[PDB]
Design an enzyme around this catalytic site. Structure first.
Site, mmCIF file in Angstrom:
data_model
loop_
_atom_site.group_PDB
_atom_site.id
_atom_site.type_symbol
_atom_site.label_atom_id
_atom_site.label_comp_id
_atom_site.label_asym_id
_atom_site.label_seq_id
_atom_site.Cartn_x
_atom_site.Cartn_y
_atom_site.Cartn_z
ATOM 1 N N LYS A 198 0.862 -1.172 0.000
ATOM 2 C CA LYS A 198 0.000 0.000 0.000
ATOM 3 C C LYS A 198 0.900 1.223 0.000
ATOM 4 O O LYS A 198 2.088 1.106 0.309
ATOM 5 C CB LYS A 198 -0.927 0.005 1.226
ATOM 6 C CG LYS A 198 -0.202 -0.096 2.544
ATOM 7 C CD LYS A 198 -1.158 -0.307 3.686
ATOM 8 C CE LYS A 198 -0.400 -0.521 4.981
ATOM 9 N NZ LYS A 198 -1.338 -0.619 6.122
ATOM 10 N N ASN A 206 3.472 1.834 2.666
ATOM 11 C CA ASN A 206 4.641 0.966 2.732
ATOM 12 C C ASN A 206 5.589 1.157 1.555
ATOM 13 O O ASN A 206 6.472 0.321 1.335
ATOM 14 C CB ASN A 206 4.212 -0.499 2.866
ATOM 15 C CG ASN A 206 3.706 -0.822 4.254
ATOM 16 O OD1 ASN A 206 4.113 -0.180 5.226
ATOM 17 N ND2 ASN A 206 2.819 -1.815 4.363
#
Ligand SMILES: COc1cc(/C=C/c2ccc(O)cc2)cc(OC)c1
Length: 275
Positions: free
Chosen positions: A139, A142
């Site tokens: 995502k 990250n």
């Protein structure tokens, strides 16, 4: 597996906090003996066997074991691991340019800017999937930049806290990732493999190109229900100037059946990506 039990403060000085999560906090740090800078991720240990607070040692050891295998320009590197009674402390490569997500709110990207980021993500995921490592938590949060001030920043995948080796093609283990980014098989508690990462890449690509989240509902249950039903569409207001080939790339990733979803190798050969 046991880690270094000397006091981390005897070998590092900590500084600015980079991120804070459910059971972890990340602080910029500097090794005293070399002056080199790192990110120290402090992970709270479970204090009892049956507790829900803290991270189980099995989960910490898996994250450490995966980090120890990886070395690639688009993935964070692990320097050292310490532990005491309360925490395991991962000394990780310092990635200081901020989230792709924080960078996202500064603009929606052009297709070239999006593909420049996306190609680095795909290269890092290609490396991981070649090692049969599913990340399971891809995502924007990250995905972080080394330097946010250059025209084409270099990105690194961080946070291997949900990553698993997939030595049997799938794992059956429950992944409580972020609803907006998890694949239907995660939502439905089905066996999971590398395919789940490819769905998340599809979500990330949709956001990069439009600034909008394809499945986001008003509540977490709505988002999960939308994911499982593959309830998304390309809003003309956001995609009117996006190429059909970019849409085709996304459409071949946001596929309910994992077996029919593009693989990492498919994604690199797709005409939108292949040079
Ligand atoms: C601990 O919870 C978080 C950790 C992190 C880890 C950030 C990070 C930053 C630099 C690094 O070199 C490694 C991790 C990020 C978060 O939101 C962006 C939340």
């Amino acid at each position: 597996t046991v880690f270094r039990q000397e006091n981390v403060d005897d070998y590092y000085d900590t500084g600015e906090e980079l991120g804070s999560g459910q059971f972890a906090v990340v602080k910029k740090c500097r090794e005293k003996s070399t002056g080199l800078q790192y990110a120290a991720k402090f992970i709270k240990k479970r204090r009892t066997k049956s507790s829900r607070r803290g991270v189980s040692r099995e989960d910490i050891e898996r994250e450490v074991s995966i980090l120890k295998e990886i070395q690639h320009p688009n993935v964070i590197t692990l320097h050292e691991v310490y532990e005491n009674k309360t925490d395991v402390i991962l000394i990780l490569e310092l990635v200081a340019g901020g989230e792709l997500f924080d960078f996202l709110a500064e603009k929606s990207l052009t297709e070239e800017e999006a593909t420049e980021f996306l190609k680095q993500i795909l290269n890092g995921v290609y490396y991981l999937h070649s090692l049969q490592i599913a990340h399971f938590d891809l995502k924007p949060e990250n995905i972080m930049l080394l330097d946010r001030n250059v025209p084409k920043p270099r990105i690194k995948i961080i946070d291997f806290g949900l990553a698993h080796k997939i030595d049997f093609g799938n794992e059956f283990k429950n992944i409580f990732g972020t609803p907006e980014f998890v694949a239907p098989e995660i939502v439905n508690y089905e066996p999971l493999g590398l395919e789940a990462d490819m769905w998340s890449i599809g979500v990330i690509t949709y956001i990069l190109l439009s600034g909008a989240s394809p499945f986001l509902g008003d509540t977490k249950q709505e988002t999960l229900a939308n994911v499982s039903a593959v309830n998304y569409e390309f809003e003309d207001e956001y995609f009117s100037n996006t190429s059909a080939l970019a849409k085709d790339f996304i459409r071949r990733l946001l596929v309910k059946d994992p077996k029919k979803r593009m693989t990492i190798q498919d994604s690199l050969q797709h005409p939108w990506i292949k040079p």
